[PDB]
Amino acid sequence: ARGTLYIVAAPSGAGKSSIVNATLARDPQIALSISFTSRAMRPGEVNGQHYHFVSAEKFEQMIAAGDFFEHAWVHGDWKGTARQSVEPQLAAGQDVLLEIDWQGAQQVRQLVPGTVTVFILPPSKQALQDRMRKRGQDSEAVIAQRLGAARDEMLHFNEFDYVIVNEVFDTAVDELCAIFTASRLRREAQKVRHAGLIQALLT
Amino acid sequence: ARGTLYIVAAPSGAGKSSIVNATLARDPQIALSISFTSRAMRPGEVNGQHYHFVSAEKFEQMIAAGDFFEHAWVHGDWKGTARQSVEPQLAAGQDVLLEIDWQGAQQVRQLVPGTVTVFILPPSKQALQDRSEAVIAQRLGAARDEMLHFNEFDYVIVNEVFDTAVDELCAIFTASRLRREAQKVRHAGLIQALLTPD
Ligand SMILES: Nc1nc2c(ncn2[C@@H]2O[C@H](COP(=O)(O)OP(=O)(O)O)[C@@H](O)[C@H]2O)c(=O)[nH]1
Ligand SMILES: Nc1ncnc2c1ncn2[C@@H]1O[C@H](COP(=O)(O)OP(=O)(O)O)[C@@H](O)[C@H]1O
Ligand SMILES: Nc1nc2c(ncn2[C@@H]2O[C@H](COP(=O)(O)O)[C@@H](O)[C@H]2O)c(=O)[nH]1
């Protein structure tokens, strides 16, 4: 039986990376996908861990070769999910979580129906920019650019099945765990999981 | 924000009552609905505890008056959920859980936006038969007949480990409140603020 595809989206600084890492730590049957990008590395990022960093020319070569399940132009740079990160794992029964923008999520919904998509919101407009300040060493000029990019991302929240407002971190983790647990209890997933038991009960 | 309508259905002997009771103890935002029935009270029964017991004439009067949100002929007696048991709590923001049969579950799915329906299965056929040989055969047959409608429900829980079954039902309640359309109402002002420029 094929694995389930999960998408968690949020503007940067809403805390999706930290919530997802705590959730997958608690729910290890979902594997995290490492995206490719052509944007430059930020301090604290490690190539091969947080992203597969490539040049813009290399990313575009990979586009032409069909290497990407989805890809999109995000904040002036390429971001993308390689086919090797999704299609083989889903066919092998591995659940996969993608952390992508709304453009990539729209492409994925067209390719894989049944994807479970979640959007994470900050608890206030001020809380968003406060979290950007605490995280990086970004100049106030960069922070202003990211906030404008954050509103652009949040304008597409309505495309997602679930919405989490990340006020209390531990609560947001519980709530994402609840969504992942609930998705395994959906009728069609349980029919596969318990085909023999159900066959026995109804005969 | 309006409350959610939840339906938990199961054949007898799946352990549904204990799972629902344990969930309500953990989640005080969930009100349990007391159904009306025309079945005769058995000795020792308390009206208003498990059911609102009425006469067959009174139940049918209530059917005629449109008093029932859903109602059905269940195992030879009338069963139904009155609107006064759900509509006020739903409007006040309290979630309401219904313990009804599949006939009632079908009616509610048609009526109310957001209704979440959950079907609970026993972990094996032998586990059910453990929970008059002709009466036992009748009871298993009513159990099989109810399980034939599991495919009409949004979620399925197999009650193998009790504590896991309660967690899973709680997870379903939590997840349902995070659905987009509920959260847009709940955080309407927040979303307007986040999407408005400087
Ligand atoms: N449609 C409907 N079915 C109900 C309602 N209340 C209970 N039932 C169903 O009636 C069946 C018998 O209920 P139960 O209390 O276990 O048995 P009883 O004590 O002999 O009536 C179960 O399958 C319940 O799901 C109700 O309000 N509406
Ligand atoms: N609920 C929260 N309350 C306060 N700070 C939070 C909360 N969630 C995350 N943070 C912090 O906000 C910043 C955003 O971190 P991160 O998860 O990487 O955000 P994103 O991946 O959305 O860019 C981090 O400094 C993180 O520790
Ligand atoms: N389309 C797409 N967007 C991605 C991918 N990986 C990360 N993103 C998104 O790009 C945005 C910017 O991330 P950042 O540049 O801050 O790491 C975030 O919304 C993030 O989720 C990917 O593989 N595809």
UniProtKB/TrEMBL annotation, chain A:
Positions contributing to ADP binding: 13-18, 131, 135, 166-167
MF-aspect GO terms: ATP binding; GMP kinase activity
Binding site for ATP: 10-17
Annotated EC: 2.7.4.8
Residues of the Guanylate kinase-like domain: 3-181
A GO CC term attached to the entry: cytosol
Class of the enzyme per the UniProt entry, highest EC level: transferase
UniProt KW Transport keyword: no
SMART domains: GuKc (SM00072)
Pfam families membership: Guanylate_kin
Signal peptide: none
Entry keyword set: ATP-binding, Cytoplasm, Kinase, Nucleotide-binding, Transferase
Function: Essential for recycling GMP and indirectly, cGMP.
Designated name of the protein: Guanylate kinase
Organism: Stenotrophomonas maltophilia (strain K279a)
Gene: gmk
Automatic annotation (TrEMBL), chain B:
Source organism: Stenotrophomonas maltophilia (strain K279a)
Gene Ontology molecular function terms on file: ATP binding; GMP kinase activity
Residues noted as binding ADP in the record, renumbered to the chain: 13-18, 131, 159-160
Domain Guanylate kinase-like: 3-174
Residues reported in the UniProt entry to bind GDP: 35, 39, 42, 51, 70, 79, 101
Gene3D superfamilies the UniProt entry points to: Guanylate Kinase phosphate binding domain, P-loop containing nucleotide triphosphate hydrolases
UniProt xrefs under CDD domains: GMPK (cd00071)
GO CC list: cytosol
Binding site for ATP: 10-17
Family: Belongs to the guanylate kinase family.
Keyword list, A-Z: ATP-binding, Cytoplasm, Kinase, Nucleotide-binding, Transferase
Gene name tied to this protein: gmk
Cellular localization per UniProt: Cytoplasm
Role: Essential for recycling GMP and indirectly, cGMP.
Catalytic activity, EC: 2.7.4.8
Pfam families from the UniProt entry: Guanylate_kin
Binding site for GMP: 10, 12, 16, 35, 39, 42, 51, 70, 79, 99, 101, 146
Protein name stated in the entry: Guanylate kinase
